[PDB]
Structure formats: C-alpha cells, structure tokens
Design a protein around this ligand. Structure first.
Ligand SMILES: CCCCCCCO[C@@H]1O[C@H](CO)[C@@H](O)[C@H](O)[C@H]1O
Ligand SMILES: CCCCCCCCCCCCCCCC
Ligand SMILES: CCCCCCCCCCCCCCCC
Ligand SMILES: CCCCCCCCCCCC
Ligand SMILES: CCCCCCCCCCCC
Ligand SMILES: CCCCCCCCCC
Ligand SMILES: CCCCCCCC
Ligand SMILES: CCCCCCCC
Ligand SMILES: CCCCC
Ligand SMILES: [K+]
Ligand SMILES: [K+]
Lengths: 276, 262
C-alpha cells in the first residue's frame, strides 16, 4: 500500500504522457497544414528577388552577397536599423527598456526581442532569474489572492440579486461573470487599446494578449515597442493579467479533471457491457 | 485585513530597478561597440562595391527586414517541437504562426495544452520526487546515526547531483552539437528550463537521435527547476522572517534607547 499506489500512480502518468504526445502530434499536423504552404510562397518569391538583384547588378559579389545578408541576419540578433537614412540610432538597452527586459525575465515571459550579449549580463541574468522568478511568484500569488477576494465581494451582491424562490447550480452563474468581466477587463479592454496604439489587427491583439499572459512570449509582437505613460501601466496590466490567466488556466485544468473522469467511467461501462 | 502585498510589490519594483541599472551597465556599452561597427561594414560594402549604391541598398535591407517576418521550417518534425514550446510556455519565438487560422488555433491549443501539460509535469514531478526520495532514504541512514542541520547536508546533495544531472551533463551533451562556450550552455539550460525561453540560443540553427531525447530532458528538467525555484522561494520565506524580527529588535532597542536618553 506504500509502493502499491506508486504502481497506481505510474500507470496514471504514463497514460497522460501519451495524451500529450498525441496532442502534440495533433497540433503539429494542424500547424504544418496552416503554415508550411504560406512558407513556400515566400520561400519561392524570395528566390525571385535574389535573382532579380543578382542579374540587375552582376558586379555584386555573387558568392559573397549571402555573406552580406547573413552578417545582417547575424545582426538581426541585435536591434539593428542600419541604414544611410538614420545612420544615427537609439539604444535598445536604454533607461526604460532594460527595466522591461527584467520584467520579462522574472515573469518568465522572455520575449527574446533583446537578449544579453555580454558574458557578465548572461551570468547576472541567470542569477537574476533564479532569484527573481520566485520573488515575483510571491507578488503574483498575493495579487491573485488580492484580486480573488475583490471578485468575492462583487459576487456576494450578484448572488443575492438572483435569489428567487440551489447552491450547486448558482455556482455556475458566478463562474460565468468572472470569465465575462475577465475577458472584458483582461482580454477585451487591453487588446483594443493595443490596436489603436500598435496598429495591429483585431486578432493580432488578442493573439498578443494570450501569448503574453500565458507566459509563452514568442516576441513576434511586443507592446514595449510603441508617451511613456504607456509602458508603466502595461507591465502593471501584465501583473494582474498574469494573475487572471493563472485562475483561467487553473479552471481549465479543473474542467479537464472532470472530462478525464467522465470519459474514464464512460469507456469503462462501454467495454464492460459490450452487447448493449 | 493587512494587505502585505503592497510591501512585496515595492520589493519587486525595487528589484526590477536594481536589475535594470545592472543590465544597461552590462549591455549598453557592448551595444555601442556593435552598432558602431555595423556602420563600419555598411560603408565598407558601398566603398568595396561602387556597383551597389545608397539608393540600391536600403531596398535590399528592407526586403531582409521583410524576411525578418519569415526568415523547410514547419516540417514534419519542426511543427511538433513548436507545439512542444507552446504547451510548456517556453515559446522560444524562433518560429511563430503567421496565418490567421494558425493564431486562432495556437490560442486555443495553448489554453488547452498548457493545463494538460501541467498534469503531465505534476505527475513527472511527483514521480521524480519519489525516485529522489528513495535515494536519500539510503543516504539519510549511512552517516546520520553515525555522528535540523542534517536537512542541510541532504539538500546540498540534491542541488549538487541535480545540477549535475539537469544542468552540467545536459549542457555538455549539447556541446557535442554546438558547444561554443561553457557559459552559453548553462545560460541556455537555465533560460530554457525556467520557461523564459528567449530563443537566441536554440537547436534550430544550422540544423534524430538528438531531438527526441532533448524534449524528454526538457520534461524532466522542467520538473527539476520547478522544485529548485520552489525551494528558493522557501528560503526567501525564511530570509523574510529572519529580516522581519531583525528590524523588530533594532527598532525596539532604539525605541527605549531614545527613552533612556530622556
Ligand atoms: C556522448 C559520447 C561521448 C564522446 C565524446 C566525443 C566528443 O566529440 C564530439 O563528437 C561529436 C560527434 O557527435 C562532434 O560533433 C564534435 O566535434 C565533438 O565535440
Ligand atoms: C554561473 C553562476 C553560478 C551562480 C550559482 C552559484 C552556484 C550555486 C551556489 C552553490 C554555492 C555553495 C553553497 C553556498 C550557499 C549558496
Ligand atoms: C483514452 C482516450 C485517449 C484519447 C482522448 C481523446 C484525444 C483527443 C484530443 C483532444 C481532446 C481534448 C479534450 C479531452 C481531453 C481528454
Ligand atoms: C536585490 C534586492 C536587494 C534587497 C532588497 C531590499 C531589502 C530590504 C527591504 C526589506 C524591508 C523589510
Ligand atoms: C543577495 C540577495 C538578493 C535578494 C534576495 C533577498 C532579498 C530579501 C527580500 C526582502 C523580503 C522582505
Ligand atoms: C476569434 C476567436 C475567439 C474565440 C477563441 C476561443 C474561445 C475559447 C474560450 C475559452
Ligand atoms: C479602467 C481603465 C480605463 C482606462 C481608460 C484610459 C483612457 C481614458
Ligand atoms: C471555436 C469553436 C470551433 C468549433 C469547430 C467545431 C467543433 C466540433
Ligand atoms: C560578472 C558580472 C557580475 C555582476 C554581478
Ligand atoms: K516564455
Ligand atoms: K513561462
């Protein structure tokens, strides 16, 4: 009964492993069905513009033109805007941007738009993270409980205004108004204000909002690029929005417990009778 | 009634301000070195090739900048690893979806995959947390009866043997493939398994016995830092309670000090 439940646990983990593997295979085929075609469209139309530029200027160093392009791609790893118009440039590690960089590291967002290139900054970032990630975690948990009780007060009013002539079902009305206001306060309202500032689409905003507050942080779209009244309230929104998806992603996990137990007993009965 | 969050808020803001000044002290110098020497190669190129001119180079750069939005990627295996980043919330960003449908799929794929992977990780964490538990049951006998502080010797051997298993040795298997420095490896290892994932260092550059085991290592290494980052939070809880009573005494001894001086 000590190492029995361990045998009962290893069976549980191994099944979840295959669920994730299949889930990754499911997603993979969907992305390469959605992305690999439009890749080859650009892949073949960039070969057009190369042979445009090579024949229009044969006296360019043909075999040493990619060496130019790749040293620009090596320079993509820095925030370059190397041009003849605006040869003068601005720091990407300035007084405010390095503050935002640390904001990504402790939240583990880490967009990657700007990464440290100095061996000193790398060793500092390692220690700054190993200490800042837990530090920020206690802030978030406090903000989560702080916000989780602000929600508790607003629902005490609403769960009286709908008391006509059961508990188990009133709980569902309460969970709706959280996601309702939540996707308004922490999805809708931010994504809209990012649309008039960043000039995105309507999807690019919510895509950004999700990728950011799910602490995935690709860095393809970043809000820190665009008053400077702006960036202080942004990382504040992130703090509370991270606390928001923390509950959202935790609720989705609870739903998947139910769906796992419903489908366990379902196939259990399905295979048990087998004659129906 | 007591918030206690406001005080933690200022600690983080202060901690961000500390880190910020340190980073621009560390990075803004070498930024100027590179960005003044990129202006070097640019006038190098126009002088070494009068064939090319100013009015002919910006259109080359901007179409490379248009290629920044693109770069076979997304192949049979690459899209698998892409999904591996999304559910773990690593998200290097080396390759991101450009299609309107791929974004809407990625949003849903994450909202469902992140919690799903969380149950896998929690099982692997408890699975590994008891594998470690049996190794220390042996060790917490052989020299513990022999001659509060015994906890500390045991906790060292975890970080010791863990930073071997989950930092040292994995960092040196990737030196097989691309080991430039001893720092870039451990920098990569930390940034990866902390789920920060900048993407400046990843295996996708200049790229099948390798990539399957790597994602496996990630699964177990993510569980490793999960405990490591959770232990560090516990020690900070201790250090917070140590420094609470410390100011408690010094503000108390200075209290009736100012009364004794009357
Ligand atoms: C784990 C096996 C231990 C064997 C140690 C051998 C180390 O050599 C490495 O072998 C790699 C081939 O795989 C090459 O790419 C690298 O040139 C080199 O760094
Ligand atoms: C490359 C940066 C390394 C920073 C981490 C230091 C190693 C881990 C600390 C081990 C030092 C001995 C234990 C003393 C208490 C921290
Ligand atoms: C034991 C049955 C394994 C197959 C379960 C269905 C896999 C379909 C993946 C997408 C479903 C996600 C929601 C349900 C999670 C169990
Ligand atoms: C890098 C962080 C340095 C220490 C932060 C200040 C600690 C003193 C404030 C604690 C008040 C209780
Ligand atoms: C070298 C110390 C790095 C900062 C981590 C400890 C700071 C203590 C935080 C104060 C808690 C109230
Ligand atoms: C534009 C698509 C918006 C709907 C995304 C899916 C909603 C999931 C709610 C949890
Ligand atoms: C409660 C947030 C409202 C912010 C509005 C800013 C524009 C006036
Ligand atoms: C966002 C909802 C997608 C619905 C597709 C059909 C589900 C069976
Ligand atoms: C090597 C740089 C360390 C800064 C704390
Ligand atoms: K991330
Ligand atoms: K993360």
């Amino acid at each position: 009964s000590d190492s029995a439940i361990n045998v009962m646990k290893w069976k549980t983990v191994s099944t979840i492993f295959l669920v994730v593997v299949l889930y990754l295979i499911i997603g993979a085929t969907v992305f390469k069905a959605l992305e690999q075609p439009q890749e080859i469209s650009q892949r073949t139309t960039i070969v057009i513009q190369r042979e445009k530029f090579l024949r229009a200027h044969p006296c360019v160093s043909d075999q040493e033109l990619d060496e130019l392009i790749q040293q620009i791609v090596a320079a993509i790893n820095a925030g370059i805007i190397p041009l003849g118009a605006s040869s003068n440039q601005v720091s990407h590690w300035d007084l405010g941007s390095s503050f935002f960089f640390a904001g990504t590291v402790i939240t583990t967002i880490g967009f990657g738009n700007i990464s440290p290139r100095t061996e000193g900054g790398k060793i500092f970032c390692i220690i700054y993270a190993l200490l800042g990630i837990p530090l920020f975690g206690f802030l978030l948990a406090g903000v989560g409980d702080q916000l989780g009780t602000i929600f508790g007060k607003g629902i005490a009013k609403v769960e009286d205004t709908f008391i006509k002539w059961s508990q188990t079902k009133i709980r569902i009305i309460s969970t709706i108004i959280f996601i309702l206001f939540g996707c308004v306060l922490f999805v809708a309202l931010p994504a809209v204000i990012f649309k008039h500032i960043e000039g995105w689409s309507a999807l690019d905003a919510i895509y950004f909002v999700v990728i950011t507050l799910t602490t995935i942080g690709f860095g393809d779209y970043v809000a820190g690029g665009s008053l400077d009244f702006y960036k202080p309230v942004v990382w504040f929104w992130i703090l509370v929005g991270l606390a928001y998806f923390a509950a959202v992603l935790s609720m989705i996990g609870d739903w998947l417990r139910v769906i796992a137990k419903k489908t366990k007993e379902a196939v259990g009965e399905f295979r048990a009778h087998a004659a129906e």
